[PDB]
Amino acid sequence: SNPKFENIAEGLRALLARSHVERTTDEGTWVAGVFVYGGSKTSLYNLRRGTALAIPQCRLTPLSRLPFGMAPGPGPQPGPLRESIVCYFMVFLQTHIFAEVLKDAIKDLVMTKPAPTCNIRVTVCSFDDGVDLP
Amino acid sequence: SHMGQGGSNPKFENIAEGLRALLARSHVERTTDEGTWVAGVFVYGGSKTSLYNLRRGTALAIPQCRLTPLSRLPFGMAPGPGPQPGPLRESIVCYFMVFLQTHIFAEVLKDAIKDLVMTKPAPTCNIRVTVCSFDDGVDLP
Ligand SMILES: Cc1ccc2oc(=O)cc(O)c2c1
């Protein structure tokens, strides 16, 4: 009933089906993830919905906003709390090996789409002590 | 030290002062020439108000960092009910993330937050924190 989200999920599944790495552990801890940002608010939201369908084993934050980085020139730098218009979401995962596969799959999927979707960025991230999701 | 009207300061200002005191013990690099955002601390739990105060105090204490807004965590094992797929369901537990340019400073800040919140009453003392690492950095705008 949501063909847009399901079609993104299918694109992701086709890429993910080409690898067979473990997505869960007996420990069950949330120790890795992918950090997904840019594009546009709507395109990121749509990707998030498709990720949820394609990967039951993950957990997702809502969209939120990124702060600014460094400003060029002699100043002023932005305050740490200032919010940009660029959005992000986090995917929590139980294995780093699958985080790497998902990062590769997102990169491969979005590059086949027109802007702004192709401007979505992704990096693997790790959590030293895990995140105790409730 | 400075004292506001009536002999008290806001909680976020006292957090800033506490963080400044703890961080002053560690003379580690906070920035790099490359200027890339490769590390962070992920802060969660407590309550929305206690995280709000911690976030505001961290910003006041550390100009070299960048912070996300407060947001909400998904569930772990066995998510709560909802019409949407399990991975998307939101708990009532909140979080924010601090981005940093060095891994050592993320470690120092993680330890400072842990030490500071342990001195505060519940629910602030229930705040949790882990260092995180971004393999390719985050290209903040
Ligand atoms: C793979 C992907 C991700 C997000 C998207 O977001 C959109 O708005 C339209 C899409 O075709 C799309 C595709």
Author numbering:
A (entry chain B): 474 to 607
B (entry chain A): 467 to 607
Copy out sentences from the published article reporting this entry, exactly as the authors wrote them:
We determined the high-resolution crystal structure of one fragment bound to EBNA1. We soaked the fragment AC37287 into preformed crystals of EBNA1 (468–607). The crystal of AC37287 diffracted to 1.3 Ångstroms and was solved by isomorphous replacement. The lactone is sandwiched between residues N519 and T590 within the range of a hydrogen bond of N519. This molecule binds in a region that is important for DNA binding. Superposition of the crystal structures of both EBNA1 bound to AC37287 and to DNA shows that AC37287 binds to a region that sterically clashes with the phosphate backbone of DNA. This pocket is made up of a core of hydrophobic residues—Ile481, Leu485, Leu520 and Leu582—surrounded by the polar residues Asn519 and Thr590, which make hydrogen bonding contacts with a DNA phosphate.
Critical for maintaining viral episomes are the homologous Epstein–Barr nuclear antigen 1 (EBNA1) and KSHV latency-associated nuclear antigen (LANA). EBNA1 and LANA bind to specific genetic elements on the viral episome, where they recruit cellular replication machinery to initiate DNA replication, regulate viral gene expression, and tether viral genomes to host chromosomes during mitotic segregation. The stable dimeric core of antiparallel β sheets is surrounded by three critical α-helices that mediate important contacts with the DNA.
